[PDB]
Write a protein that binds this ligand. Structure first.
Ligand code: CU1
Length: 195
């Protein structure tokens, strides 16, 4: 359990005093829960962490109850940004961040859009930030925005793949963190400009 806090994701904007409906379970956007994701929905998840079986736009997607297209942060293109995750129950696993470089609030984000910009960690270590220790609190991740990419209505997607289930690793082996895991996604509305 945790949420993208800086910039604030859609279901957490109430915490900062925005006029968006509150979600007191904003730490629980776990794709409808593990069994719903993996037993009901074939491993699929909404773009923004909702149960995949809900119709689009889902509650945390643009046009859903929490998706009012209110920009919560403005960044310079190509800059290093520092994002904060509030981790309430610190399940082992890793985080990834994707940018849908959308320019119109009336079109809907898709995973294909997000997948065009998988964000690199500023430290050069790749695309996955690993939370190695079970410690609740605020985790900061420094990310490099892609050079030359600007967007007036961007969506930032945080993905958390937990690692607390044992499964077939596919190499003849099984292991902790192999196979399907509980997953979280959160979306935040941001803008990126040359400035
Ligand atoms: Cu949790």
């Amino acid at each position: 359990h945790g949420h993208l806090s800086v910039p604030p994701m859609r279901s957490s904007m109430w915490r900062d005093g925005y006029n968006v409906p509150p979600n007191y379970n904003d730490d629980g956007l776990n794709c409808g829960s593990f069994d719903v994701q993996w037993v009901k929905n074939g491993g699929k998840c909404g773009e923004c962490g909702d149960d995949y079986s809900l119709p689009r736009p889902r509650p945390n997607e643009s046009g859903g109850m929490y998706g009012k297209n209110i920009i919560v942060a403005n960044y310079q293109q190509g800059s290093t940004i520092s994002v904060d995750l509030h981790i309430q129950a610190p399940h082992i696993g890793f985080f990834e961040f994707r940018l849908c470089a959308r320019n119109d609030p009336n079109v809907l984000e898709t995973q294909d859009c997000f997948d065009q910009h998988l964000l690199e960690l500023a430290d050069g270590s790749g695309t996955r930030f690993t939370m190695e220790e079970h410690v609740a609190g605020e985790y900061t991740v420094d990310l490099k925005l892609p050079q030359g990419v600007t967007c007036t209505n961007c969506v930032l997607q945080w993905f958390w793949r937990t690692g607390n289930r044992y499964g077939d690793c596919g190499d003849g082996t099984s292991g902790m963190g192999c196979g399907p895991q509980e997953e979280y996604r959160n979306c935040a509305d941001i803008a990126i400009a040359w400035s």
